């Protein structure tokens, strides 16, 4: 549907006319609905769960990662998550990198503090590192499942008028999805800008904004971690140890 | 032996002397735990321990103390400190301990979630309810004071500048300028209405600009 | 006489937070510390834990010597208290947390801290990257890979129906805090400086990514 | 020796106000409190009430344990003192009122307060709306309805003659204060926050309604 | 026993010492009732 507007000035009978197409306003309104974005995120998570299900991966993720002996399931789960994220970024390639190897880490002695899934080149083939105890500690941590994070009127008006997926399981799925999303961002910088840039990014995540917004911000969908604005409680007080009398002329990351 | 009795005892003496009398130095949480441990472990201070523990929440009480009980509490607390005291000292120390036990302790940092975009709910809202809600939200904001240099209305009577601006904007049609201004106003209004999930009343927006005919007819 | 149940519950919650085994963010007061210490003292089979946490009052007095059977028994005691894995590093986290809580002064507003003083080799992120780096390549991979993305409308509808009552914001909060706590614990255990500038810049990157 | 009659009258009036059983607004002084407490102590059959109100001196000492016969006898004593229904919630209102009066400091101007601290579940208006809401629909209605407005001039004249000597302002004051006190007591008993903004906005609505 | 005699007594001592001599800290209404009860009972 189209809406027409007419402007008339008091010096003549001239009328200048413009046509507005309502679809743009409808799209903005739909993008402003909380239920719409919630449905988008939940549909992404549901597609992830369905993708795991068709790969027999019905067992809870914590149970999958708790099995030390069976490495094939862990490798398949991580590879499938990487492929799902890759398809989300590029909705044209259904198969991930056709050949890559997996190594599972069970020791702190060879563990990376903060990047549980890491990628490296052995001069012959891609290799992916999986820190199994880190993922186990992530998924096994007790979750806050009774607290409320900030409509009562619609509830009042209403009052006057089969796979068993618990909340813990869904939170575990989302946790693994976000972790593999971080790993995939690192891997994307790797594959597209070299090992040097990948190891530069491992120590400074601020290069993501420059090496993603050039291509991803205008071609792919929205990232899962962008659904909410995350901040550290009392960040300024803790950061007060490292304060600079700064002069920022290349503040490329607000 | 699990309890270093004497060091606990002096810690409790110091803390209770500070809270009861010196209501005006500083102590750590460890000393508070120490004082409570001493009060619990010492047999003759059980009544005082219960009285101070009643300050943990607002749904705890104490049975009415008979006379001999209040004298026992009093000389026990005096043995804690020779200075003469009474039940009022017990009351002020209890209030100080109540303030202390409600003091928050250290906690690790947590990731706090902030709403990215003020996403509206499914049900459409009219202009009036939206106005009420947004006015309530604005009420919570902190206004800023603006002080003008003087009371006189700003103006300019420089002829040369006035005819010069007029000449510069002379080749600029009024029709196109007014059309652009009205259309950008309308587009911004409609965009805000769509984002706010508010119903747009076309008749009201049309009634906005009827001063044209009001002037022309009268 | 004290209420064993209330003190046990307060101890359970405070230890859950102080062990980084839970993301439940409940404002803890001095009363909870008093209750947890009193319960630890009173319960016979938590005497080892009570002595362990009480030794933290003085920074110069460090952890008591425990033979392997004693450490195993204390681990079982902690597991029973939490009814949940739990190992020695959890006990180290608890010791450090309680030491910092005890040595902290009484104050009106909750003090926000980060995990520190757990587990000689004070390193940074890059040396760990290199070092552990090879220790990785040293290991041979286990699996060789050399993809169905079904859009079954009914199946996704049922999945959405199951997921619909879940408060997405709570799930995101739980996942983000879990990742943050795991990263912080790995940093502290590895004796590597945790640069919260980088971690916050991750979120800043996401925020800057969205608006383009 | 004290005058039993004067002390009894002062106690009656002060308890009438402090039980919210009367709208009579008479400025009460400390002397009335002294008289009511002394009379409560002296009278043998008001000893239970005197002890009950005296326990309110310390906030940590709560209500004495009374067996059912004792509670019934105290209820009869309160009824006799007021010669008026009266039940346990009236005693709770009286206890809270006297506790707040006693713990209040001596001051030159009367302190205006609202009823609070009577009757675990701290709720708000909307949750109560929903909750009690159904508990309502749960009940089946008793009566089914599926109208004379006579203007008999002589009858209305006689009714006006009967009503004419009544000071309309006093009737309005009594009705409004009665509604306010019933609403406040229902809010406090239900442990729901009484939002006096809304109640005052009711009057503001009436005022704005009239002038249009 | 209905009257906690000694606590009442010290309350009355404090209140009467405050009113009689220190005409210039602060007390609650409860202390006034307490003092009158002590004066009547003694």
HEC-encoded secondary structure of D124-193: CHHHHHHHHHHHHHHCCCCCCCCCCCCCCHHHHHHHHHHHCCCCHHHHHHHHHHHHHHHHHHHHHHCCEC
Task: At D11, list the tokens.
Answer: 């106690």
Spatial CA neighbour of C1 closest among C57, C60, C42 = C42
Q: Which residues contact C191 (CB under 8 A, 6 or more apart)?
A: C119, C120, C121, C122, C123
The whole-angstrom separation of Cα D97 and Cα A151 is 37
The whole-angstrom separation of Cα C66 and Cα C74 is 10
Task: At B201, list the tokens.
Answer: 């009343």
Task: At A158, list the tokens.
Answer: 């209403």
> In this structure, are residues C162 and A218 in contact, taking their beta carbons and an 8 Å threshold?
no
Q: Give, as one character, the DSSP assignment of residue B149.
A: S
Task: At B112, list the tokens.
Answer: 């706090």
Q: What ranges in B42-173 are assigned the alpha helix state H?
A: 46-53, 67-80, 87-101, 127-139, 159-168
Task: At C116, list the tokens.
Answer: 């520190």
The whole-angstrom separation of Cα A85 and Cα C152 is 19
Buried b (16+ CB within 10 A) or exposed e, A189-201: bbeeeeeeebbeb
Assign C146 to helix, strand or coil. Answer: coil
The whole-angstrom separation of Cα D117 and Cα D93 is 9
Dihedral-angle region of residue D191 (phi above 0 means left; psi in -120 to 50 means alpha; beta otherwise): left
To which residue do tokens 């220190």 refer? E22
> In this structure, are residues B26 and C106 in contact, taking their beta carbons and an 8 Å threshold?
yes
Q: How many CB pairs under 8 A join B and E?
A: 16
Cα–Cα–Cα angle for A87, A89, A95, nearest 5°? 25
State how beta strands A100-105 and A2-8 pair. Answer: unpaired
* Element at C144 (helix H, strand E): strand C143-145
Across the interface, which of E1, E5, E7 has its CB nearest the CB of B87? Answer: E7
> In this structure, are residues C164 and A39 in contact, taking their beta carbons and an 8 Å threshold?
no
Burial class (CB in 10 A: 0-12, 13-18, 19+), A171: buried
Task: At D106, list the tokens.
Answer: 């001596």
Task: At B97, list the tokens.
Answer: 């301990």
Question: Which of B108, B115, B116 to mutate: most C Cβ within 10 Å?
Answer: B108
The whole-angstrom separation of Cα C95 and Cα C75 is 13
In order of B65, B100, B105, C31, the CA distances from B54 in angstroms are 14, 13, 19, 11
State how beta strands B111-114 and A229-232 pair. Answer: antiparallel
Spatial CA neighbour of A159 closest among B22, B143, B150, D129 = D129
> In this structure, are residues A185 and C205 in contact, taking their beta carbons and an 8 Å threshold?
no
> In this structure, are residues A76 and A57 in contact, taking their beta carbons and an 8 Å threshold?
yes
> In this structure, are residues E13 and E20 in contact, taking their beta carbons and an 8 Å threshold?
no
Q: Give, as one character, the DSSP assignment of residue D117.
A: S
The whole-angstrom separation of Cα B27 and Cα B18 is 9
> In this structure, are residues C137 and A122 in contact, taking their beta carbons and an 8 Å threshold?
yes
Give the 3-state DSSP-derived string for A170-222, with helices as H, strands as E and coil as C.
Answer: HHHHHHHHHHHHHHHHHHHHHHHHHHHHHHHHHHCHHHHHHHHHCCCCCCCCC
> In this structure, are residues C182 and C89 in contact, taking their beta carbons and an 8 Å threshold?
no
Hey, what's the torsion of the CAs at C114, C116, C118, C122, to 10 degrees? 130
* Element at D205 (helix H, strand E): helix D196-210
Give the 3-state DSSP-derived string for chain A, with helices as H, strands as E and coil as C.
Answer: CEEEEEEECCCCCCEEEEEEEHHHHHHHHHHCEHHHHHHHHHHHHHHHHHHHHHCCCCCCHHHHHHCCCCHHHHHHHHHHHHHHHHHHHCCCCCCCCCCEEEEEECCHHHCCCCCCEEEEECCCCEEEEEEHHHHHHHHHCECCCCCCCCCHHHHHHHHHCCCCCCHHHHHHHHHHHHHHHHHHHHHHHHHHHHHHHHHHHHHCHHHHHHHHHCCCCCCCCCCHHHHCEEEECCHHHHHCCCCCCCCCCCCCCC
> In this structure, are residues A226 and C209 in contact, taking their beta carbons and an 8 Å threshold?
yes
The whole-angstrom separation of Cα B129 and Cα B114 is 25
The whole-angstrom separation of Cα A49 and Cα C182 is 24
Residue B111, strand partner residues: A232
Summary count for chain D: helices (H), strands (E): 9, 0
User: How many residues belong to chain B?
Assistant: 218
The whole-angstrom separation of Cα A121 and Cα A99 is 12
Spatial CA neighbour of B48 closest among B81, B93, B10 = B93
In order of A203, B160, C100, C127, C186, the CA distances from C134 in angstroms are 17, 79, 36, 11, 18
How many CB atoms neighbour CB B160 within 10 A? Answer: 7
To which residue do tokens 């404002």 refer? C27
HSE at residue D181, side-chain half, CA atoms within 13 A, is 18
A 11-30 → D contacts, CB under 8 A: none
Chains D and B touch (3+ CB pairs under 8 A): yes
User: B64 touching D, CB under 8 A?
Assistant: yes
The whole-angstrom separation of Cα A4 and Cα A15 is 12
The whole-angstrom separation of Cα C65 and Cα D85 is 70
Residues of A in contact with D127 (CB under 8 A): 152
State how beta strands B111-114 and C112-113 pair. Answer: unpaired
User: C49 touching B, CB under 8 A?
Assistant: no
Our CA-based measurement puts residue B67 at a distance from the nearest CA of chain E, in whole angstroms, of 6
Residues of A in contact with C84 (CB under 8 A): 140, 142
Q: Which residues contact A199 (CB under 8 A, 6 or more apart)?
A: C129
> In this structure, are residues C98 and C18 in contact, taking their beta carbons and an 8 Å threshold?
yes
The whole-angstrom separation of Cα B120 and Cα B135 is 16
How many CB atoms neighbour CB B52 within 10 A? Answer: 25
Say yes or no for a CB contact (<8 Å) between B119 and A33: yes
* Element at B111 (helix H, strand E): strand B111-114
Q: CA torsion sign, E13 to E14 to E18 to E19?
A: negative
Assign E27 to helix, strand or coil. Answer: coil
Assign B145 to helix, strand or coil. Answer: coil
> In this structure, are residues B64 and D64 in contact, taking their beta carbons and an 8 Å threshold?
yes
Supply the Cα-derived Rg of chain B in whole angstroms.
36
Q: CA torsion sign, D188 to D194 to D200 to D203?
A: negative
Residue A231, strand partner residues: B112
Task: At D161, list the tokens.
Answer: 């003659």
Q: Which residues contact B22 (CB under 8 A, 6 or more apart)?
A: none
Instruction: Please tell me which residue of chain D has the smallest CA distance to A157.
Output: D130
Assign E28 to helix, strand or coil. Answer: strand
Spatial CA neighbour of B40 closest among B86, B71, B17, B9 = B9
The whole-angstrom separation of Cα D104 and Cα E28 is 6
User: E27 touching D, CB under 8 A?
Assistant: yes
How many CB atoms neighbour CB B192 within 10 A? Answer: 13
The whole-angstrom separation of Cα B76 and Cα B54 is 18
Our CA-based measurement puts residue E9 at a distance from the nearest CA of chain D, in whole angstroms, of 15
* Element at B108 (helix H, strand E): strand B107-108
Cα–Cα–Cα angle for C111, C114, C120, nearest 5°? 135
The whole-angstrom separation of Cα D112 and Cα B115 is 41
Say yes or no for a CB contact (<8 Å) between A160 and D133: yes
Residue A65 — φ and ψ, nearest 5°? -75, -15
Our CA-based measurement puts residue D151 at a distance from the nearest CA of chain E, in whole angstroms, of 58
Rounded to a whole number of angstroms, the distance between the first and last alpha carbons of chain B is 102
Spatial CA neighbour of C123 closest among C71, C204, C189 = C189
> In this structure, are residues D26 and D10 in contact, taking their beta carbons and an 8 Å threshold?
no
User: B52 touching D, CB under 8 A?
Assistant: no
Across the interface, which of B121, B174, B179 has its CB nearest the CB of A11? Answer: B174
Q: Give, as one character, the DSSP assignment of residue C45.
A: G
The whole-angstrom separation of Cα B118 and Cα B134 is 12
To which residue do tokens 């195993």 refer? C72
Assign B114 to helix, strand or coil. Answer: strand
Residues of B in contact with A34 (CB under 8 A): 119-122
User: E26 touching B, CB under 8 A?
Assistant: no
Please give the order of strands across the beta sheet that includes A100-105.
A117-121, A126-131, A100-105, C143-145
> In this structure, are residues B106 and C115 in contact, taking their beta carbons and an 8 Å threshold?
no
Our CA-based measurement puts residue C121 at a distance from the nearest CA of chain A, in whole angstroms, of 12
Spatial CA neighbour of A229 closest among A193, A210, A254 = A254
The whole-angstrom separation of Cα A57 and Cα A87 is 19
Q: Which residues contact B32 (CB under 8 A, 6 or more apart)?
A: B15, B100, B101, C30, C33, C34, C106
HSE at residue E35, side-chain half, CA atoms within 13 A, is 17
Q: Give, as one character, the DSSP assignment of residue B198.
A: B
The whole-angstrom separation of Cα A122 and Cα A111 is 18
Q: Give, as one character, the DSSP assignment of residue C211.
A: T
The whole-angstrom separation of Cα B102 and Cα B104 is 6
How many CB atoms neighbour CB B112 within 10 A? Answer: 18
To which residue do tokens 């071609």 refer? A219
The whole-angstrom separation of Cα A175 and Cα A172 is 5
Residue B155 — φ and ψ, nearest 5°? -165, 175
The whole-angstrom separation of Cα B46 and Cα B41 is 8
Q: Give, as one character, the DSSP assignment of residue C190.
A: T
Task: At B209, list the tokens.
Answer: 């600009």
Across the interface, which of B3, B32, B113 has its CB nearest the CB of C106? Answer: B32
Q: Give, as one character, the DSSP assignment of residue D111.
A: P
HSE at residue D153, side-chain half, CA atoms within 13 A, is 0
Q: What ranges in chain C are assigned the alpha helix state H?
A: 4-18, 30-42, 47-54, 68-82, 88-103, 125-138, 153-163, 168-189, 196-210
User: B127 touching D, CB under 8 A?
Assistant: no
Hey, what's the torsion of the CAs at C135, C139, C142, C145, to 10 degrees? 70
Cα–Cα–Cα angle for E13, E14, E15, nearest 5°? 95
Cα–Cα–Cα angle for D185, D190, D194, nearest 5°? 60
Rounded to a whole number of angstroms, the distance between the first and last alpha carbons of chain A is 40
Our CA-based measurement puts residue E31 at a distance from the nearest CA of chain D, in whole angstroms, of 8
Task: At B71, list the tokens.
Answer: 């004298």
Question: Which of E3, E7, E17 to mutate: most B Cβ within 10 Å?
Answer: E7
State how beta strands C143-145 and A229-232 pair. Answer: unpaired
To which residue do tokens 């209030």 refer? B95
Q: How many CB pairs under 8 A join B and D?
A: 19
Burial class (CB in 10 A: 0-12, 13-18, 19+), C91: buried
* Element at C143 (helix H, strand E): strand C143-145
Task: At A109, list the tokens.
Answer: 């002695």
Assign C166 to helix, strand or coil. Answer: coil
Rounded to a whole number of angstroms, the distance between the first and last alpha carbons of chain C is 63
Q: C-alpha A187: how far from its chain's center? A: 14
Buried b (16+ CB within 10 A) or exposed e, C10-31: bbbbbbbbbbbbbbbbeebbbb
Spatial CA neighbour of C11 closest among C39, C48, C49 = C39
Spatial CA neighbour of C113 closest among A245, A228, A115, B104 = B104
Task: At A128, list the tokens.
Answer: 């992916």
Residues of B in contact with A5 (CB under 8 A): 182-183, 186
State how beta strands A100-105 and C143-145 pair. Answer: antiparallel
State how beta strands A100-105 and A126-131 pair. Answer: parallel
Spatial CA neighbour of C48 closest among C4, C14, C16, C91 = C91
Question: Which of C11, C21, C30 to mutate: most B Cβ within 10 Å?
Answer: C30
The whole-angstrom separation of Cα B177 and Cα A29 is 29
Say yes or no for a CB contact (<8 Å) between B112 and A232: yes
The whole-angstrom separation of Cα B107 and Cα C18 is 8
Supply the Cα-derived Rg of chain D in whole angstroms.
22
């Amino acid at each position: 549907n189209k809406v027409r507007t007419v402007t008339e000035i008091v010096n003549s009978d001239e009328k200048i006319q413009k046509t507005y197409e309502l679809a743009e306003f409808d799209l903005k309104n739909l993008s402003s609905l909380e239920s719409y974005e919630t449905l988008k995120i939940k549909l992404a998570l549901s597609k992830y769960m369905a993708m795991l299900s068709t790969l027999e991966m019905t067992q809870p993720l914590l149970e999958i990662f708790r099995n030390k002996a069976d490495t094939r399931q862990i490798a398949a789960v991580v590879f499938s998550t990487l492929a799902f994220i890759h398809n989300r970024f590029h909705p044209l390639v259904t198969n991930f990198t056709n050949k890559m190897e997996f190594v599972v880490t069970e020791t702190n002695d060879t563990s990376i503090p903060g990047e549980p899934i890491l990628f490296t080149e052995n001069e012959g083939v891609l290799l992916c590192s999986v820190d199994r105890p880190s993922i186990v500690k992530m998924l096994s941590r007790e979750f806050d499942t009774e607290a409320l994070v900030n409509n009562c009127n619609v509830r009042i008006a209403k009052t006057f008028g089969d796979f068993s997926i618990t909340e813990v399981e869904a939170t575990q799925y989302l946790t693994l999805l976000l972790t593999v999303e971080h790993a995939y961002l690192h891997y994307y910088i790797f594959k597209n800008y070299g090992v040097f840039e990948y190891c530069k990014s491992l120590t400074d995540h601020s290069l993501f904004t420059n090496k993603l917004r050039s291509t991803m911000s205008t071609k792919t969908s929205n990232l899962l971690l962008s659904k909410f604005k995350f901040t550290i409680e009392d960040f300024d007080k803790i950061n007060s140890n490292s304060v600079t009398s700064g002069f920022n002329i290349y503040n490329f990351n607000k | 032996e699990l309890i270093n009795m004497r060091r606990y005892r002096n810690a409790a003496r110091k803390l209770i002397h500070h809270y009861s009398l010196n209501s005006t130095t500083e102590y750590k949480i460890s000393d508070v735990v120490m004082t409570m441990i001493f009060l619990l472990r010492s047999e003759k201070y059980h009544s005082l321990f219960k009285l101070l523990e009643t300050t943990f929440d607002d749904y705890t009480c104490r049975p009415q103390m008979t006379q001999v009980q209040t004298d026992t509490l009093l000389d026990a607390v005096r043995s804690l400190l020779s200075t003469t005291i009474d039940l009022t000292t017990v009351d002020i120390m209890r209030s100080s301990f109540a303030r202390c036990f409600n003091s928050p302790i250290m906690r690790y940092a947590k990731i706090v979630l902030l709403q990215n975009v003020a996403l509206q709910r499914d049900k459409r809202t009219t202009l009036e309810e939206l106005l009420i809600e947004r006015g309530e939200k604005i009420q919570m904001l902190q206004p800023q004071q603006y002080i003008n240099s003087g009371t006189e209305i700003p103006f300019c009577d420089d002829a040369e500048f006035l005819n010069r601006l007029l000449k510069h904007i002379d080749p600029y049609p009024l029709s196109r300028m007014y059309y652009n201004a009205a259309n950008t106003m309308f587009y911004t209004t409609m965009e805000n209405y769509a984002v706010s999930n508010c119903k747009f009343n076309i008749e009201d927006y049309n009634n906005i600009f009827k001063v044209m005919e009001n002037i022309r007819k009268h």
